Symmetry: C2
Subunit: 896 residues, 2 copies
């Protein structure tokens, strides 16, 4: 190597490090911050951003009379004379419809604590839940994450007049402390990021935003919850501002109007969720808009404590613009404060003229509007409201008109032409030019805040399962009804709805599942759930306390087979079909026919009548069903088998390889077929059975305290059956052409060992509770002699299930094409002194051997706490927007 | 240039850019922050950090009973039964001594507003002023600066139990709003940095500190004010927590003690001043310690809302250590949040053992303590209080012992030995190993904060003026008493105290000044000021309203000469001697003597009798004094001269060069000598004298409405004197051998014009209000013809004085070795229509011409609003620490 190239490599490394350093500096200074969702409670029964957008664009108001359910004494409160004390001269204001409502149980709050709680905190809890739901995130997924909370909240004298009542738990404090406002959100959602509650007058919310941005840029918080709340429980503010004559007589905020005369106050709660743009892209979240820069400062020594200052506003605007490295011609509109104050509006307009309006393009003037003209003035939640207005304008591509600007104030020389007020709705559609806007807030204390916002960057008939959950039956019914209403539209994408329910919603104790192929059946089932009568077979429900289980796979013996089982699954399940094909190829150098042909009943294959064909086929089917179950996230904890089912279990446990299992099954099946028409079996008190059997010499298996199977020669079998039928319980016969688990087996031992003395077991990965020696077994112990013993000795199913049940296992999934052992398992569990909320489920049925039946089985399991990865059932689908949780509210108010 | 050299240049630029970028990254992330000043108000009459240190090191307690001056109904309040409602079973706690006191006038707030004010805000104002003064900074110097304010404060209920009245200004709302708590600090001090108030339970202060550090690093603020306040207006907290039995029976916080049983509450306010270390070093501030890193987080879904969580504490400790890049072995002591709670303390100790205690060196176990055990609980200001104690420990190099630790708690295991409690004071002298400590805060809301701290980096008999000022006479006397007591100490430094007063204190309305050379004269003068009798000589007082003045310079004519004038100045003033020496050099090729000889009265120098020597000496002295005035920052707005004085003025203004002025003055002096013993002058209504003069043929000047000057031949002079003597007012004579401003002069006209025709005047940088033509003149017009006319035509001194007076000028300075026109100027301004507070002052006196007299003259000027740059008088002196303002307090309290 020469000197020049050695210098060049150093230069290249230095340049790369320089680029990385510049990237880090940009990340720390002006990293773009995205917005993922938003939520709001606002006057006039407004609780969705869509409703607010409709109101704004239409151009309505929410002003109304005083509330009447808050214990206020309206009689003495009203008086015409402003000078009269303890009275106000206005009777119009914004208010919330149901501020007294709350659902204590959903948040695990006792009634007394709920009553002691400030309504603000309750509304923040509800709005935070709805916010996290809207973004498309499971609320439970945030437990244990660096998520911050930043709120602007202040006390409004709630419950002070309430006579001191006994309070052992100190509810009196935690219900009114502003810090607890965000502390309780963090506590309930389980967040670990910083929790802060600021109070800087009416600009609090934006202040809370600014801090949050820094936290997100310092890599200290992954997500931020930013917003404000204002719910006045007493009329004190009205009286105080009436003393100063700072209230509009009619109660309207006429921003920049000739008749501006004061404030129109209102309540409201608002929240937004913030994350880094790059992290939003990486996680796949959706983006509504982007934040670029912000600026804060103080008016300083102004003319009076509460008077505004123009120079401070100009300085903060310029700082905000320079921080993000933009120019004043880059902005298109401003959501100015505009509280309708007589003295303030001209100042703000002049500042805007001097900062943006100067040297403005003659054709592209700055559009100026105010949201306070419509919704009023919420103080603590004022700025975030303007931000939300800007976001809605961006999404809908339109600029709502601002009200009461028919006659602009003469004090601002609009002849300059740099700015213009939105007298009517203006299209703001996307195009080559970038869209940007600016939001402002000016606290009475003197702090000012200015923020810049920019547009976001440019961007079959198979079975469908649907899951729904809630914490109460009424809530579950309401949820089902809401989903039904949603699905009745022609636009709904059934797969999208299913995926959204499966992945973007939390799982509560009350659960209900519906598998459907068309929307009509789905809505029918949802109506059944809402009405409380789940008669249909496509609807299941349940209630559970634990989100997990200890799953066990049961592998039964004969009886489950039936012609055509698995035909549909072959075409519908690539995993199952692949397992069957693999088993076919593995079994290939032992025989001619293929299980794949047998299932389809193709031309030229044996039927399900000879042992040598049924046993391998059942083995293959059962293994494939086990693979399918595992595919959906259900990894077994232990495996149990019945007779040759043990083989399959061993293959599932990993102790054996597929080829060895095929050899074993083929061997045993052929050597058993060698005994065609030489023995029999029948079904049925173990001791009583043995005593009755003594007279002869011909016990096979034990399935419970009363279920018993007997085997042996035909003649003695008939003799015993005749006696038993003449004494009591029936003797049900079995379809088989031999006698198993009997001395008859002794003859064929040597050939079996000759054939199968070459298998090489392995260590196990899943507990293999053998039914032969009744204990956990090491994979090494399963040799040819073990399988001879398994074939020879008696079967102990009841004992195995009992040992498993009292060991802490509570879920039992029999892997078979038909339920034949569920009943015995249920009876044993009931007689067992183990977990009482056990769940037992089959896999398929004699009929309905299609994917839908398997999904119904999985839903029956899921509604009982077993985890399922429903997303697997919905390949290629995209999630869909859904409504929020239907809270069941009650009244909680502390009255004097 | 070879390829290698160019590649080397590219490489060098890349490397330097990379290094600068890494520096920028470090500045943004973990730039060290310095502490410059601190202030506190605490129980037991503790109002200074020094008192707190004394208390802690001695190991005292401030516990006391409930206040009796807040209106609380004590009889009903106290009761033993815990469950009896509306009563408290604890009767001891920490309280401030003068919560109700406040100085209203100083902060410019009316008594009614102050009464409506929350005491917290008042104490915040006082403590903020004291904090800014302690740093060694003029509070008025922060006006128009980007200084942020961050506080942790919450409401307690001042004013709810009173009746609403006429509040036209909104005092009821403004007084109690927490946002206004910081808004008022910003407003009164004229700061433009962000003002933010937070509430996060007991950890609010450290959260504010974290935010302030972030803001300082971002460059958003130049300096930050951080701290908290907690004043208990009503006994709600006590009764409330009594309902829960959460309070200690004795009210003593036995942190980490076997007897810990609950809380003990106290009131307190604390503040600290922060700025980047490099900025403090560059500006030259004092550094008390360095803050390195901090971390905030939340308990998350802990065991209950109010319960603590150890894992969160460990996480925040690790984040705090990692933020600045340190190791647990680098910390020598921690100040826990030990509140004396049985549950909490073991958890915190266990968390500490797992982070610093793990793998800890066996010869330096981490020292553990808690300040709360001494001053109880401070709630909102708790965190910052701990930070205080550490800093003091750093400054004094000692760790105070902790109280109530006679028997450590058994729940925690100290056998590990990684952590040890501070049973007794431990020497902590500065040495090779760096000293570091940590502070912790855990709020009930669930927010946990951790911070790290490090020690700061390593580092005649002339006259002296002492200045004092205040907004009230009583405050001024109190200040003077404080300064005298400071000087009475043996360690007191005179120059340091003088400079500290000059540069580190704001200048207020009422002012006083004492010039002294020894501490004895100083202390006596201060005592006389404190007595209210300014009878002494080296003491001046006054009251001024404006901080500036339109100053004017006055140059009198003959009369101010005397023997020995300027002897002390030649030695005690380099500027004066330099200017006079320059004049001598400029004067060399016209004469032989040096004016220095005449002033020193060196042998062989002409006496002050011959007119050919007197005038140039006055010229030189006047220009030298003008330069002396300039050097102290007293720049003249305009100049005015009497007779030859204009020449001097012309040099001060800049129209004439020193050499040219010497030429003109020497020529005039010689031509006047040429007419020795041929004329006379005498002093004296202009009309009354003009009507008298008609008979003869000889008027010289006009000094005022009655003061007039006459010149003429000896015979007519004596005749006029005889006539006026037998008619009334006297006629003073003048010592001179000629007649000036008369037809006599016309003889020597042409020779004067020829000799002095080489001058080349220039534009004048300062207004030159010529008295020859009664208006301002440009320099270029001042030719030899003009100067001949000056020597010839009458003077209009009074008219010039009046015109300058009514034109807005208010301060007149007579730059001369003796005042000869002070009375006339004072009268002239009296009958004018300008400012009524015009100040007039001389420069020296016949009796006394040393630097001290000139300083007294400048003090007489300064006490009337004229700015002076005193620090020039105190070169090299190191500033000295001084006490803060002596607030005069009155009771303001809203009673039920």
């Amino acid at each position: 190597v020469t000197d020049s190239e050695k210098v060049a490599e150093y230069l290249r490394r230095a340049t790369l490090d320089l680029r990385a350093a510049r990237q880090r500096i940009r990340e720390l200074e002006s990293d773009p911050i995205a917005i993922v969702s938003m939520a709001c409670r606002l006057p006039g029964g407004v609780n969705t951003p869509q409703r607010l957008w409709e109101l704004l664009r239409e151009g309505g108001e929410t002003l109304s009379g005083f509330p009447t359910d808050r214990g206020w004494d309206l009689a003495r409160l009203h008086h015409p004379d402003p000078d009269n004390p303890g009275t106000s001269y206005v009777d119009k204001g914004g208010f919330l419809d149901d501020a007294a409502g709350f659902d204590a149980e959903f948040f695990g709050v006792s009634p007394r604590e709920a009553a002691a709680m400030d309504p603000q905190q309750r509304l923040l809890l509800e709005t935070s839940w709805e916010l996290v739901e809207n973004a498309g995130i499971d609320p439970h997924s945030l437990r244990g994450t660096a998520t911050g909370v930043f709120l602007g909240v202040a006390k409004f004298g709630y419950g002070e007049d309430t006579a001191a009542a006994e309070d052992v738990e100190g509810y009196s404090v935690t219900g009114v402390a502003p810090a607890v406002a965000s502390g309780r959100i963090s506590y309930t959602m389980g967040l670990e990021g910083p929790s802060i509650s600021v109070d800087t007058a009416c600009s609090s919310s934006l202040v809370a935003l600014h801090l949050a941005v820094e936290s997100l840029r310092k890599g200290e918080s992954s997500m931020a919850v930013v917003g404000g709340a204002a719910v006045m429980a007493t009329p004190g503010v009205f009286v105080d501002f009436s003393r100063q004559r700072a209230l509009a007589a009619d109660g309207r905020s006429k921003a920049f109007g000739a008749g501006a005369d004061g404030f129109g106050f209102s309540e409201g709660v608002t929240l937004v969720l913030l994350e880094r743009l790059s992290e939003a892209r990486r996680n796949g979240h959706e983006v509504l808009a982007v934040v670029r820069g912000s600026a804060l400062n103080q008016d300083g020594a102004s003319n009076g404590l509460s008077a505004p200052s123009g120079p401070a506003q100009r300085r903060v605007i310029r700082q905000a613009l320079e921080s993000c490295g933009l120019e004043p011609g880059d902005v298109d509109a401003v959501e100015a404060h505009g509280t309708g104050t007589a003295l303030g509006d001209p100042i703000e307009a002049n500042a805007l003229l001097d900062t943006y309006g100067r040297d403005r393009d003659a054709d592209r003037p700055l559009w100026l509007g105010s949201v306070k003209s419509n919704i009023g003035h919420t103080q603590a939640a004022a700025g975030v409201t303007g931000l939300l207005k800007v976001v809605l304008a961006l999404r809908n591509g339109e600029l709502p008109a601002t009200l009461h600007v028919e006659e602009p104030t003469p004090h601002v020389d609009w002849s300059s032409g740099g700015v213009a007020l939105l007298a009517g709705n203006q299209p703001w559609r996307r195009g080559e030019r970038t869209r940007r806007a600016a939001v402002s807030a000016f606290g009475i204390s003197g702090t000012n805040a200015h923020v810049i916002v920019e547009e976001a960057p440019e961007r079959d008939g198979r079975p469908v399962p649907l899951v729904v959950s809630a914490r109460s039956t009424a809530a579950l019914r309401a949820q089902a009804a809401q989903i039904a209403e949603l699905l009745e539209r022609p636009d709904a994408d059934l797969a999208g709805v299913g995926l959204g329910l499966a992945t973007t919603r939390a799982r509560h104790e009350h659960r209900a599942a519906v598998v459907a192929s068309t929307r009509e059946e789905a809505v029918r089932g949802l109506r059944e759930i809402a009405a409380g009568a789940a008669t249909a077979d496509a609807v299941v429900e349940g209630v559970t306390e634990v989100d997990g289980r200890n799953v066990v796979f049961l592998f039964p013996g004969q009886g489950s087979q039936w012609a055509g089982m698995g035909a549909e699954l072959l075409s519908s399940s690539p995993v199952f079909a692949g397992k069957i094909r693999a088993c076919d190829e593995s079994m290939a150098p032992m025989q001619d026919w293929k299980v794949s042909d047998v299932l389809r009943q193709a031309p030229g294959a044996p039927g399900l009548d000879r042992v040598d064909v049924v046993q391998p086929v059942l083995f293959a089917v059962m293994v494939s069903l086990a693979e399918l179950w595992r595919s959906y996230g259900v990894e077994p904890a232990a495996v149990v088998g019945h007779s040759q089912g043990e083989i399959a279990a061993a293959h599932v446990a990993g102790a054996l390889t597929l080829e060895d299992a095929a050899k074993l099954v083929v061997g045993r099946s052929r050597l058993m077929r060698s005994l065609s028409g030489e023995g029999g079996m029948a079904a049925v008190g173990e001791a009583a059975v043995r005593e009755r059997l003594r007279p002869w010499q011909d016990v096979a298996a034990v399935n419970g305290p009363r279920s018993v199977v007997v085997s042996g020669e035909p003649g003695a079998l008939r003799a015993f059956s005749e006696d038993c039928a003449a004494e009591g319980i029936r003797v049900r016969d079995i379809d088989v052409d031999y006698a198993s688990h009997s001395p008859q087996i002794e003859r064929v031992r040597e050939e079996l060992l000759e054939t199968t003395g070459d298998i090489a077991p392995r260590p196990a990965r899943v507990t293999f509770h053998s039914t032969v020696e009744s204990r956990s077994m090491d994979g090494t112990e399963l040799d040819a002699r073990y399988w001879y013993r398994n074939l020879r000795e008696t079967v102990r199913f009841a004992d195995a299930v009992t040992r498993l049940a009292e060991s802490g296992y509570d879920a039992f999934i029999e892997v078979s094409p038909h339920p034949v052992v569920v009943q015995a398992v249920e009876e044993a569990v009931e007689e067992a002194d183990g977990a009482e909320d056990a769940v037992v489920v089959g896999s398929l049925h004699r009929d309905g051997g299609d994917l839908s039946a398997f999904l119904r089985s999985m839903a029956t399991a899921h509604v009982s706490g077993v985890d399922i990865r429903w997303d697997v059932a919905l390949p290629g689908a995209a999630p869909f927007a859904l409504p929020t949780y239907p809270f069941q509210r009650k009244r909680y108010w502390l009255q004097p």
